[PDB]
Amino acid sequence: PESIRKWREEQRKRLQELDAASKVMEQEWREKAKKDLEEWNQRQSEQVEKNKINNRIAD
């Protein structure tokens, strides 16, 4: 019945959908990593400021 046409088309569409899904998942993971980095840098800056205050109040 020459099913090679659908054989190629359905698989190509499924692969194109899976690639887009994987790209969206990777972008979401990158955004989560950036949010974690921003959350860690703020705490690091707060700790640096607390250490500076403790060194100032030492004298």
Binding site: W29, A33, D36, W40
Partner: protein, 73 residues
């Protein structure tokens, strides 16, 4: 296709040591928290100069501060 345990086990059995830098970059892009865990086991088979050079390039020196305490020897 990614998994924490499988990658942590197969990272030590590779031949090409240049893949360590690419893995570190991809982790920093995806999972920056596991960078210290990866460096703890990759420390023998990885250069310490290029790692800190890349960390200073991307401005991530204090992120690996606890790792530097185990390489002072």
């Amino acid at each position: 296709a990614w998994k924490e345990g499988q990658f942590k086990d197969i990272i030590t059995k590779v031949a090409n040591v240049e893949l360590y830098y690419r893995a570190i970059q991809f982790y920093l892009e995806f999972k920056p928290l596991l960078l210290n865990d990866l460096l703890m086991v990759l420390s023998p088979r990885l250069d310490h100069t290029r790692a800190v050079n890349y960390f200073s390039k991307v401005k991530q020196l204090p992120l690996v501060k606890p790792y530097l305490r185990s390489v002072q020897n």
